[PDB]
Design a protein around this ligand. Sequence first.
Ligand SMILES: *[C@@H]1O[C@H](CO)[C@@H](O)[C@H](O)[C@H]1NC(C)=O
Ligand SMILES: *[C@@H]1O[C@H](CO)[C@@H](O)[C@H](O)[C@H]1NC(C)=O
Ligand SMILES: *[C@@H]1O[C@H](CO)[C@@H](O)[C@H](O)[C@H]1NC(C)=O
Ligand SMILES: *[C@@H]1O[C@H](CO)[C@@H](O)[C@H](O)[C@H]1NC(C)=O
Lengths: 119, 116, 122, 117, 118, 119, 122, 121, 122, 122, 122, 121
Amino acid sequence: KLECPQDWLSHRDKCFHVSQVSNTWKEGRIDCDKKGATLLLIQDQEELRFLLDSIKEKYNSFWIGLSYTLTDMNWKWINGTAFNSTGVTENGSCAAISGEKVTSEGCSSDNRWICQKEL
Amino acid sequence: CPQDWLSHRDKCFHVSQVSNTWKEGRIDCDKKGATLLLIQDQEELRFLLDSIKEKYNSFWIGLSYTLTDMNWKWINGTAFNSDITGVTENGSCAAISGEKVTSEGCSSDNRWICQK
Amino acid sequence: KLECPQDWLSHRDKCFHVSQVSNTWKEGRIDCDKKGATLLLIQDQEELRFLLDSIKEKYNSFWIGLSYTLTDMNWKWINGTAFNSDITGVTENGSCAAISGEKVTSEGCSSDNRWICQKELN
Amino acid sequence: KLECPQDWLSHRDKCFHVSQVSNTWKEGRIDCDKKGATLLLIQDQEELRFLLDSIKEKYNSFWIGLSYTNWKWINGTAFNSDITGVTENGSCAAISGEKVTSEGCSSDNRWICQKEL
Amino acid sequence: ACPQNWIGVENKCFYFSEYPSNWTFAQAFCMAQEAQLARFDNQDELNFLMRYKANFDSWIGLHRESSEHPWKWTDNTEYNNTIPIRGEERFAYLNNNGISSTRIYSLRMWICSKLNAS
Amino acid sequence: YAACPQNWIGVENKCFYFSEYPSNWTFAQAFCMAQEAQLARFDNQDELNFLMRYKANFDSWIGLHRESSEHPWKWTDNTEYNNTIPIRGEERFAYLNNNGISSTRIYSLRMWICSKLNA
Amino acid sequence: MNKTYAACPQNWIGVENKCFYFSEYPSNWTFAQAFCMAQEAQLARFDNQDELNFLMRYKANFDSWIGLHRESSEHPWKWTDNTEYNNTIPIRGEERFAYLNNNGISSTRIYSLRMWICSKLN
Amino acid sequence: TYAACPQNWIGVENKCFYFSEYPSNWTFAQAFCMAQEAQLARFDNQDELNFLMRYKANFDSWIGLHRESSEHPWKWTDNTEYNNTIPIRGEERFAYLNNNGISSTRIYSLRMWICSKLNAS
Amino acid sequence: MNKTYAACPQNWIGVENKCFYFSEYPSNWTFAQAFCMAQEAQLARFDNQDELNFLMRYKANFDSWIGLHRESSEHPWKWTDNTEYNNTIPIRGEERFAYLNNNGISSTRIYSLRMWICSKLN
Amino acid sequence: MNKTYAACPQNWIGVENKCFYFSEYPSNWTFAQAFCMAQEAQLARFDNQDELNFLMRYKANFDSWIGLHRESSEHPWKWTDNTEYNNTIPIRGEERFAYLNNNGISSTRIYSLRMWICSKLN
Amino acid sequence: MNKTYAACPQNWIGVENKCFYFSEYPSNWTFAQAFCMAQEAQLARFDNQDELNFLMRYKANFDSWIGLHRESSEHPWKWTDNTEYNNTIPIRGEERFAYLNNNGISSTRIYSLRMWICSKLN
Amino acid sequence: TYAACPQNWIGVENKCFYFSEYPSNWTFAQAFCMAQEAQLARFDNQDELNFLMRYKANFDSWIGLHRESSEHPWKWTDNTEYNNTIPIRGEERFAYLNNNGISSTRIYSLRMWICSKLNAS
Ligand SMILES: *[C@@H]1O[C@H](CO)[C@@H](O)[C@H](O)[C@H]1NC(C)=O
Ligand SMILES: *[C@@H]1O[C@H](CO)[C@@H](O)[C@H](O)[C@H]1NC(C)=O
Ligand SMILES: *[C@@H]1O[C@H](CO)[C@@H](O)[C@H](O)[C@H]1NC(C)=O
Ligand SMILES: *[C@@H]1O[C@H](CO)[C@@H](O)[C@H](O)[C@H]1NC(C)=O
């Protein structure tokens, strides 16, 4: 079984890349696809706690693979299943790790992102 | 009374547009063959105030406080009697500031009222 | 016979006013009419010599009642007989005459210049 | 026989380095010593003709191992005209154009280091 | 001489935060230091802000009533729109792409600006 | 450009207020503070010329004060006055008159001028 | 505070939404009006008592040109807009061009010299 | 630091102006200024124009304006076109300052003149 | 060229090695003198005919304060240096403070309002 | 000499009829383009060899943004006008945004940080 | 507010009691040091962690000259005062002249090109 | 309004600069600049000097600074003394720019040059 790319974070059977570059959520998805990855899908609280403790630049928000659409009236992951118990407000919003919590923000806002690769 | 002076009872008044120290005010009245204002009664004061127009300025009068006498004296030169100088006493000179007689520093620049 | 106005120059049976104010020749004519006068008509060299010696501000040009029009192709006074060489030293087009120095000069009628008004006594 | 360094010029049994950096003749000597080299000693007219044709930036002057301390090489035998075209005072020599010129040793100039094989 | 933690650029005194907050708190923080959320009046001021803000998305003094309303400074003077703001949100911040926008509650670093005066 | 408030006059980068009635130094200083201003300060010849010209014939308080006759003249900033135009009289509070600048008591009545930067 | 403003260009004075300009030397009506026009202004216009009070106060003791003119003594006073004057402050004299003096407003000929005042909206 | 204008010249900011003692035609006036390493006066700001109008007194004075004809634009001696801030009166080719502002006349007309040059090194 | 220089500070006029300032409004002798002193200058001093001609020409029609004063009518005219005036241009009137008028030099009391010229060496 | 000029605004460099602005710090293409547009300019356009020589020289050894972009590797190079590039100096790399380097012109990502050049007509 | 002040001269940045100059282009150590001395400054000196953090932050991604030099690889690092370095942040490389990089402080020969930072007390 | 600088010249604020493509001695260089109504480069501020140092690239270039001898002061082409902000290197009579700042060489030495003049008309 193959190992994580040269300068990516390794946890369980997942590879993470934290961008230094910021853009819209749509443009974030495009950068992960160009990298042969997907936006971050948080499997558990352990994975979240790891990422936060390995970020260092905790003072910036990061897009994740979670968005709210009017068509479904629900929060859906990009994999693409509905979210189960995001501290904020729901309209035409996308999720992002802002501080030590998952926050709902406008999808047009410029934010960095976390790409993930599955092993 | 002279051509452009105010007339009341048996007195002539001149209100200056020019300002200086109390000492320099006295000098201007002497050059004019006059003296600084000596208010005889409340009627004379009420007249002057109603004939000034530029009520928003202060005017020197012939009243000063000297340490030698420890009293307020007119320049004629009778000690002052309350028949009221509202301010503080040091090495001061009196002036009509508003509708009241006020004690001010003699070095301050103020207009004046001469009388004949 | 009545006398010249309070602060006008007197010579023979004529009154002169030298302006300190400048404008076009057209506007110069208008100022003389408002004054009940006309622009200067030089009768002889004696009248000219008098005016020059009574000007003082010799460093300025003064409009006179003489203009050149294409309709006549001649220099005409405003009175309005044709001019005779008894001399306008300059160029002729759509010009007006003015005393510039000790000579009558042809200038553009749009130029700003002072003027000399005259009143006849007779 | 050993070969010239990676980015030096090779001719006969000599290695040349032409600097892009300029300083006094004294500071030029110091740079050659740090490089384990010496300032340029022209052996013949063939060596000179080669260097000139391999310079490219012919519009700059280059210090050589010749100085008026009369005129002596840094090896250190006295100079023979068989010619430094300029003026002599407390001068150092430099290749200015297609001729050896005498200049002030305090002037900022580039230099040519040489390594013998 | 600007107060401690503040940087002096020409006649202005700037404060670059160390910890992030929302647009309401950020505005309140600046006001307490007799300042306001950063305003740039020329190219030089904008260049300084962009350069020194480093990799910190930082709030500036630009707000909107809605997406269909014009951008106004904290003075309530309208923005000259020289550098158009990205996003369809009501509160602007500086990023590496220029100026972007988010909701009132999002956390970002801030920039306070005041005149060096007395 | 940005017009000065109502009743104020704009001169370059400053906004000036000339009172409509006289009052003591303390109320005048308090009045200027209420308008986010201070008793009038002149920084150049132009500012002083304006004040002297528009002051008209009204003796008017300005931001200069002194602790005592033996103390230096200071602005409301507490910055000492360059004494370009020396103040006449031996009192603690300065005002503009036709002769230049004079001094009187805190309790005397004068017209006043405020000053603030257009900001 | 975090920004500085001006209200008026250099040498102008701001009174509410207007910018007045007070000359440093006198000239005639023609040059004065031309000077204001070059600064995208007009000879001074007062619309209220406050504007007129400022003009009268800051003009000091200088007889200064304003923006009122009339075709003749029998014609009404008009602004430079050609809008008629409300005659609130009656103009003294029987001449065609207005100016401010210590008594209020007086009149003279185009050619007389006076200080001037320009006004334009901020 | 401050550098004084030559004798008979007046210094206004960074410029040196010269006011003639006698009148002449535009051609001699332009030639006179050139001899002093100057040109027939040019005003670049309201302050420079105010100075000229004030000090020219009651003397109609030549300035550095010319135009090829009535239908041609006004140009400076640089051959740079005039900003037309103060429009020139008259239908003639050479400009001079008067009490009404700026008017125009013919090349052979006698006017007083003004030069101007920068107080440059 | 290379660089440009100024003969005098802003709002001052340069005449040879001297700088002169002309006021924009009138004031008494005391303020006028105080103003000049604050700019490291004095109320104008003319040392030659050229300096006096400039002052008379540029002062326009404004009666202006110059730096001549006398102790009384029977005392000599002195400059602010306390050097006596050469009396080339006699001063009119029987007062203590000199000013320039359209006729030449006249005198008035300290308190009268006039314009004012400052002077200083460049 | 009697007038001074500047050719370009402050912080800009003039080469004939064009004005150039060289950044002080690096940025990505988006901010750089936004900066130039705000100054009524565009990312640097070299018309001729002289303009290109200057850019290459004055930029020192800083990889600097120029106004050449392409939609994709298979699309033609266009200026910010959307006018196609004459391909005189072919651009190295297979990326969408051009930039000057020591070798000539190369290609990178919208997000790469580079010093920039703004250009506009004088 | 009634008066405004500046922390430092134009093109300099103020951080408490110090002023700093960040170059717009690279140069060698000799020119850099000469440039700072001309502005009554020295190549940047940091006295605390806050000063060093400012320098590292504002220097962007430019390898930039500071005021640290050593006689040889076997000699101690000294400031331009000739006061010895406290060696809090050890310097990478075996050369005589110090510059700031993204990793901290590194070293090179006198003749290499880099941006520079000047420093002087306010 | 502005005024573009001439062909082969770079414009920087109120000045205009010419950088040579060929070398010469100081005498020819000075003569060349004078013919273009200019002088060998003069820098009056740090901004002007930064320009010259940045744009001169790797071309050691003549600037308008000379000395009578090693014991004499440095003078501009105006003959105004040098403010000595950037002390010139070497003990020679004719200055030029290099990567170290300003150095000096003999009359006869060949170098490229910089002309400088005010953008004026
Ligand atoms: C989508 O991802 C979430 C974790 O982010 C996970 O719980 C869920 O099972 C995933 N869905 C599928 C179809 O694997
Ligand atoms: C002095 O004047 C006051 C009024 O001002 C008067 O009461 C008093 O009698 C006067 N004294 C003399 C001697 O007349
Ligand atoms: C017109 O005036 C001229 C003198 O200017 C004179 O010679 C001529 O006779 C006049 N004409 C008439 C009709 O009087
Ligand atoms: C010194 O070098 C020169 C050539 O540069 C040569 O002619 C001479 O022989 C050398 N001297 C010695 C001792 O080798």
